[PDB]
Amino acid sequence: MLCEIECRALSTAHTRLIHDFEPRDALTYLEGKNIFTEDHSELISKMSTRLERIANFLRIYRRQASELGPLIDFFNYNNQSHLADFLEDYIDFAINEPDLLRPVVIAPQF
Amino acid sequence: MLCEIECRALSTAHTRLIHDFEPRDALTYLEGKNIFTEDHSELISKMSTRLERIANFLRIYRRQASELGPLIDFFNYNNQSHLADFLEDYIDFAINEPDLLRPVV
Amino acid sequence: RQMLDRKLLLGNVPKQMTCYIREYHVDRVIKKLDEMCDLDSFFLFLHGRAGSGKSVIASQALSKSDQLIGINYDSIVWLKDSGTAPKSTFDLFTDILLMLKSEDDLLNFPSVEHVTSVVLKRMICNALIDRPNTLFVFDDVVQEETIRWAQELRLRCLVTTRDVEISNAASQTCEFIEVTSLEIDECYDFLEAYGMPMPVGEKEEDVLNKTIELSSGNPATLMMFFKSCEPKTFEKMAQLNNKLESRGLVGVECITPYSYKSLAMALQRCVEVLSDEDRSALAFAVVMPPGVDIPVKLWSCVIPVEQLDDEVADRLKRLSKRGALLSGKRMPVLTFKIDHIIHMFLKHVVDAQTIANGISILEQRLLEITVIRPEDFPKFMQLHQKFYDSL
Amino acid sequence: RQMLDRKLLLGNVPKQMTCYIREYHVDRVIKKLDEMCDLDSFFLFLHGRAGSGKSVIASQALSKSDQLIGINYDSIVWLKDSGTAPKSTFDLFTDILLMLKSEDDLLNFPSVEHVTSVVLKRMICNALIDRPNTLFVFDDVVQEETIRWAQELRLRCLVTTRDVEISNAASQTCEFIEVTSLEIDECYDFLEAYGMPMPVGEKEEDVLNKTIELSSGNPATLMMFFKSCEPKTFEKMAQLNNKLESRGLVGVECITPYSYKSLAMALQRCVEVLSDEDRSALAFAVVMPPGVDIPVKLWSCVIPVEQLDDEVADRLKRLSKRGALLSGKRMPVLTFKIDHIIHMFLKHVVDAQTIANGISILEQRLLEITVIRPEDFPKFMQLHQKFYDSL
Ligand SMILES: Nc1ncnc2c1ncn2[C@@H]1O[C@H](COP(=O)(O)OP(=O)(O)OP(=O)(O)O)[C@@H](O)[C@H]1O
Ligand SMILES: Nc1ncnc2c1ncn2[C@@H]1O[C@H](COP(=O)(O)OP(=O)(O)OP(=O)(O)O)[C@@H](O)[C@H]1O
Ligand SMILES: [Mg+2]
Ligand SMILES: [Mg+2]
């Protein structure tokens, strides 16, 4: 399982994960890095709308991974690096430099 | 582009690149050795905090250079040699030996 | 500023007051909440007298700055408690399970009533994952079981309550904010805000001051007085005042935003919960100076039970720490005091015989015996003979 | 150290206490648990007086080290028993079936109550495959029926209980840790921990001492007496030590973390379970020099019921092994002793008559025909008359 910090990130960066993203694109990369199952990919892969595949990808994902690695190491490869960069920035304004998360990486989207 | 070794180094030596460093200091030396662009230096040069200029210097950098040379050959000249020495040490404990960590603990 | 409203509505947060806002409190309920972004499973106690306005200010803060929702906390869950039964502390969480649940599978909502607690609790903290930085507002806690369960649920809680004797159950650091009676200067603002005649006749001035004194900062009652001055005529406020010294809150009772027509209806509930022996202490507290700093011994005279009079003080402190029923002061000398609003309720509700009985005993103690010094002058009950003649 | 908390929360483990840790015990409840990794289906009995603090120690012993959960045992299941009905020993396991179950299929949870005890048992040991080397904390066992089923379920159990007369139910590796009354030196630490004037002045040191004696080293009632030292003034501690020798635990009752407002409310339950004839023994314990090593024969005088007498001792041993109400020693001579806390419960918990009645019987056999030797001086229980003087 993840936690509040790692799940608060998937939620904060949600206005964005809706405008450009697709869970079908990540299913192959995750059945692989060992974080899914052949029913998992079935469940998220056959979904009429994308907000469905997205809400199932973010639900299923928060349970399966020991951390938020194999999803930054994916928006990179998928030419959606403007995404994996935002999330890695957010994970950094928490461990090393505390406090700075709310003024810097949280407010500019109110 | 770099790779996992050269990018794992910029990450491992990160607790340090925050305490003493500045991307403005390196922009001139890199627009030069041909690894930046006049929008690149604009983007990293106008940033309110340094952790911004640092995170953009390390993001932008990992894409542009064919290798991790023109950044050791800089912490040297900038009196920040205690940095370029740590990174050259790290590139060596991998360049001269074929053994590391495996998937373990 | 349009995303908040989505989040406020879905967290069942009541709309904050607009025509009059308290910057000092609302601004003090927001501050303390921001300070707790790093902290987890914390209690904030917005405690006060019945009708003070605690519940209004919580929502006020929640909706004012947009930082609390979005920046400091991701979502809001605001649930009214008011639980008295023993099943109530369990029922609240069933309503807090579906709240937390998805719009999907409210259809699948099972026979939740027939479920073990150890399951509702585990079932909640099992779905609470999908809820990063959650702030739960528990408007109107009476029982400590809700405080108990909550601490077992490692929740982040704003809490509106009257009794601050249950916040202490929790064995974790707790922050408190007391909703005091509306200060004199403030009141004025409250009136002008809703609307009232401006100070014009020196007497009219003085009379308005007396009125603000009576209702010891109880916006609920203040509203009751206001709503019921429709003529908005001073000449009709003076007709209304009188009605009070002859009908208690009862006559003033009118339809208001308050769930309650009459404040006496509210305070009832504050007199039921009271320790059986503490109830009578209050019952005998009726025959006392109103809004006057008076000694413990002078009180020892009417209150039930060797140089062990201290038991009087213990009752007066406990009673004061249950919806602010009393206002004990430490210096110069240990003294308490009643408030008019707190006075018209008990007076018009308690037994007159007890009132008389009490008034008869006091004289016995007397014969035995703002800078009042009832140390050589307690013998005399003639100082408040004005109040004393009324019965 | 973040994975534990996940595992603790899901196993319904309570927040470990922080402001004061009983080192020697928590460190003795962890040790013994580590020693048991191979031996499967074992019982650990953390048994003590009521409010003596057993349950808190299990919270801490599973919350200090990172070894017990992850290293020594994979998962935790902590369930509070408190079962009295005959359906209770079955109901506990229904709550231990869903605990063990997956987050999925709590929806599918069937009509579990309507099933045979041969199915709930088989149904549990059928799903118990998933989690191996799993320990189950059974906070507050009263019925030996629990200990029975568990042994049939080959479980690994920590057990918090007051009566240590149920382990007899298990034919097995039973190991024990007794939560004693808080030692004198320790207490001090407990007080200082919660913030309190320490023993400094003479009369006050002598005044601070009296306190412990009364609580007779008891954390629960040592807490209740502090949540009632609101002023925190020694002058107010003395005001109360008094309140105690006139109101028993009743007056000191102060709402706190303990599910119980009064210790007498707790001990009740320890006096209901008691053998009918053993119950009668408790009543006479009251009339006795509280906190004194006193002979068996001197007890034979008040206790109900032969050329040879040994029935008094049998009652005193059984009674001592069931809530730790009485403390008996072997050497120099077979003697037992009551504890103040165990004494005030009765002083306010027995028929006002049966106290006085019993005193007359003791005086009758009194005439007859720390090194107390009531062998030539029993005729005069005056050494204890200091207490006997009291009605
Ligand atoms: N800031 C305010 N503006 C306008 N009216 C107020 C305000 N504060 C309190 N009131 C009056 O009190 C009523 C509701 O009081 P509120 O719920 O705020 O008090 P409370 O402390 O919650 O009482 P309780 O604890 O019984 O819920 C409103 O209908 C209004 O009449
Ligand atoms: N280490 C401690 N720190 C603080 N308070 C304690 C401690 N141990 C016991 N207490 C007091 O006792 C109360 C709970 O006692 P605890 O549950 O630990 O005893 P117990 O032996 O479980 O009693 P029971 O067997 O009746 O459950 C707490 O609310 C606290 O007041
Ligand atoms: Mg309200
Ligand atoms: Mg307990």
Residue numbers in the entry:
A (entry chain H): 1 to 110
B (entry chain K): 1 to 105
C (entry chain B), D (entry chain A): 112 to 416, 424 to 487, 522 to 543
Task: Quote the passages of the study that discuss this structure, keeping the authors' original sentences.
In Caenorhabditis elegans (C. elegans), onset of programmed cell death is marked with the activation of CED-3, a process that requires assembly of the CED-4 apoptosome. CED-3 is synthesized as an inactive zymogen; its activation requires association with the CED-4 apoptosome. Activated CED-3 forms a holoenzyme with the CED-4 apoptosome to cleave a wide range of substrates, leading to irreversible cell death. Here, we report cryo-EM structures of the CED-4 apoptosome and three distinct CED-4/CED-3 complexes that mimic different activation stages for CED-3.
The CED-4/CED-3 catalytic complex was prepared by incubating CED-4 with a CED-3 catalytic mutant (198–503, C358A) (magenta). There were also three oligomeric states after global 3D classification, including 43.1% hexamers, 40.5% heptamers, and 16.4% octamers. In the presence of the CED-3 catalytic domain, the percentage of intact particles, that is, the heptamers and octamers, substantially increased, with the percentage of heptamers increased by about fourfolds. The 3D reconstruction of a heptamer contains a funnel-shaped density, an upper ring-like density and a globular density in the hutch. The funnel was determined to ∼ 3.6 Å resolution by applying a C7 symmetry. After local masking refinement, the resolution was improved to ∼ 6.5 Å, supporting rigid-body docking of individual CARD. The globular density in the hutch was clearly seen in both 2D and 3D classifications; however, the resolution could not be improved to support model building despite our various attempts. Six CED-4 CARDs, organized via group II stacking, and a C7 symmetric NOD funnel were resolved in the heptamer, with a height of ∼100 Å and a diameter of ∼140 Å. The heptameric architecture of NODs in the CED-4 is highly similar to that in the Apaf-1 apoptosome. Despite different oligomerization numbers, the inter-subunit interface varies little between the heptameric and octameric CED-4.
